[PDB]
């Protein structure tokens, strides 16, 4: 997975992710409206206060999101974090206890600013509890963003719960976020500016085409390598103006770091690849997506009809693997 | 630039390119209909016999294509080939003489199969002659493809005119095609299969996520590096079924190797990037494209109306 | 800097380092004998109880070692750890307080086994105090080894004092040791075994020469990259038999990862390069070394004459930069 | 294999190679004296015009060199060139015909300057014939150097006989020399100067250590990769003064690009590695070498006693594999 966020000069947020998986989930766009039942495994049951859009599955009427965004412009994406994610065996008294899947709606229902999320997370404990006994707990970490800032949330055996500022605007997979941030110092030799003709011991040596300054940028799908490239692209991509250009910029970056079908075969023998790329535009309350086998940009919107539905609105399910 | 071609299991061709440039050409989709006037600098002027679609600019009523495709499913893309491309100073008696820009319509107007093109090229001489005094001659090389095979055409000071089979289905920029083919042998260590946990002197070392077998795959935009990655992705992407899935596969590969705005600044100080990605589907006669600043997939079609137009038709972006 | 240790099948230790620097030190081999004055900033002054050999400089009769090894087979090398090393502003009551430079002789004078060092370090505090006001405090971390095991010692603002088992046998420079260990998982695609001929879409693609399995092994001098390469070479270098073959194996690995003069210019404008490579062989009590401008392998030995000297034995000083 | 040549400011040549192989040869230093029998397959037999030193084997009194250097300062090294090298089926009328193994002594016996070698090579034909029927024909290419210049000689099925100027001072293995020269343009992003602290989307990103400018320099043993690295190191290594410093500079570069034992296993299951590194110093008429299992720098010299011997002079044979 790769998560990405950035804004335009007007404070409009473009935020979303590639989902990179090696099996089917039947994922689809879900709109969760206001006043919808919101049970919790450890907290009091309540109802939704905000409409939410994103991609996920529905289990017994509960929308379990891979990534989702509220009508106020605050979103969250859960990305794979294997060999690292570790949640508590049971709830911890005194904490706000959430089964790990519940963080998606807890963040998007209760807050409009990442600043509020950061403060509340100081007393949150994530529990190794699945939606029901027929599912396994997904090893995930999260990127959360509004138009002002983004944070990363990781819970591990090594470090416990950590919350990091994410000025880079990106996230991938394992290992932990500080490891990846530290890794960027090893790529400071990257330069967008092309090299020029040189003399190596008197032998003329000159570029054959543009791009020579980024020698060493990795193009494989190892999470550390996609992190470096996504951070580098986001750091150097100029500001875009308008909805079309910012959505395009977003898909340009995420499609650059997509995991391409056939290029990764896991130890189980299955293809791992980017099954979808999705972008939420806070300015237009529109969720854009395309899929590995259908490149058409589909759009889904939070509006006065969808936000006030009495039922979940579910769209066509995408199948693969 | 990156050119790409592949077919499905039913013989439908998907063929197109990224255009990676550092200036605006004011390009758009041009449909050249049948019976349109077609001048030649060194041949008898004539008219088009086949309709053609693609991306380019119109210069004094001449459609100058970056890449274009005829109604019979034969196409050609011209990609930058600096420090290498060299064409004749003037026409050479006894040869079919073409100004280099004229190869685009010469190929798409006179042939339906690459086999015919390969034979006719044996007596073609490309000439260093611009469309008019107001334009420079573009240093280009070409990929030409139908549903059966693709060829690469390069004319260089170093090697003269060369025509290669292109089983890999890809082309980028300089150096020459044989140089790139030879480079692939240095990347035989790439493997789509993930690595497994290991012991380094007793220290457990294990992957943190998937993708470990492709360690060393380059992700920068140097032409040699886009060539390796595009070739590797095309070699390992399984067959796709149907128009939607094949167009998506095509765009998945080309967007992976796109040159991203802001990540390349040339020595003249300008950003170089993938301004558009375009795919021609021979089976639907449809040219798909999106642009750096508009990701929506746009479609333009050779149909009985557009193919029989009395005008050039252009669609702007 | 790159530190390296390994043993043969008879328990003989080969341990040493490349010193990679950008300024002159006039360094040379120093034998510190038994019964030599040993002052401490925060402990009772004493005398040496064990003879030590290594490379260093002499400051008012105090031998300050870059790396050193005692007559009982226990050694330590201090390697640069910039942007990370952090020692306490002053001594801490109740701790064994050592100015950071004092760890070299504290370790080699008081112990013969790493197991003892590990236990004693539980109550050690390293202080940011130079040998005198005319010297800066070097930001260092250390590898310590006997014939049974090696440890890494790092003290940082990020993590405080950490002591790691170093099964890999290597150490370089920043960042911290756990970061480098974690980085190795990103290089699991490396394989000593050569690739074979392949078909890419029907195009024959075959190796042009041997070595194809290690595609992606980095050859620059960034510390993370030398760590990966040194760890990989040591992991795959077979056992060697006898003194000459083990010393050669050692120099083969370290010279492979040397920082080559002219290839690195630091931001202060100075060339940084491997000024020397050195190996202590515990089995022969011999320190082997060569230098960037003199490749001859020189030997210096702890014996009954040198170990019982009344004076420091200082061999020729090596000037550079 | 990697070949390297450079000079000091006084016109003294340092020229030699790493021998990287996957089988035993029992190689050793051989001095071929003046007036020694010199048979040719396709030319009249003669005697040696001058003394030569280098590394090789002796076959029925014929010294067959991996690399060799005459007393007048001209040398040649034969390096593996598989999948390319192709010599003629039998001699060709009107040419100076040499079995490919005969070029080593043909060049070093008949010439002092590369300019004269190049002119003579215009009528030379290399023949696919072994020293006797018990040996295969080695698929070699050659680097030839004096103090003024170096050339590469390649005879391939792809290109026929080609002679290239070698300002870079290096040679490795396949593919052909022009391919490698062309490859260097793809590495123009390399810069000895370290990067500086940067801001990636407002996130401070700074080097952890020196060497960041050479991001992307490959460290594996694929021939193209050793060629890039060897060329880059030679291009940037400053001038050295005197015999010791220049010999050290030479060994520093070649040991940096050595093929390390255990890190390359060929498809036949055998280790490929640098069995020796050797350097001829024209100014001292001395051949320096060390070996994978004996790092001592040994010296062998062309002098009044060795150049005038009535018999071939051989030194100890080095076995491996």
In brief, what are we looking at here?
The structure is a homotetramer. The first copy, chain A, has 321 residues and is of the alpha+beta class.
What does this structure look like?
Four copies of one chain form a homotetramer. By secondary structure, chain A is α+β, with helices and mostly antiparallel strands. The first copy, chain A, has one domain: Penicillin V Acylase, Chain A (4-Layer Sandwich), CATH 3.60.60. Chain A has five helices and 20 strands. Chain A has an eight-stranded antiparallel beta sheet, covered by helices on one side. In chain A, strands 14-1-2-17-18-19 form a six-stranded antiparallel beta sheet, covered by helices on one side. Chains in contact: A-B, A-C, A-D, B-C, B-D, C-D. At the A-B interface, helix 4, helix 5 and strand 19 of A face helix 4, helix 5 and strand 19 of B. The PDB classes it as hydrolase.
What Rg of chain A, in angstroms, do the CA atoms define?
A: 20 Å
**What structural class results from the helix and strand content of chain A?**
alpha+beta
The CATH architecture of chain A is 4-Layer Sandwich
Number of domains of chain A: 1
Terminal CA distance of chain A reads 17 Å
The order of strands across the largest sheet of chain A is 13-12-11-8-7-6-3-20
Chain oligomer state: homotetramer
Succession of helices and strands of chain A: EEEEEEEEEHHEEEEEHEEHHEEEE
Sheet with the most strands, sense and barrel status of chain A: 8 strands, antiparallel
Helix proportion range of chain A:
10-25%
Reading off the top of the CATH hierarchy, the class of chain A is best stated as Alpha Beta
Number of helices of chain A: 5
Topology-level CATH name of chain A: Penicillin V Acylase, Chain A
Count of extended strands of chain A: 20
> Of all protein chain pairs, which has the greatest interface, and how many residues does each chain bring to it?
A-B, 72 and 72 residues
Strand residues, percent of chain A: 25-35%
Q: What would you call the shape of chain A? A: globular
The CATH superfamily title of chain A: Penicillin V Acylase, Chain A
PDB class: hydrolase
Keywords: bile salt hydrolase, hydrolase
Assembly: tetrameric
Entry title: Bile Salt Hydrolase C from Lactobacillus johnsonii
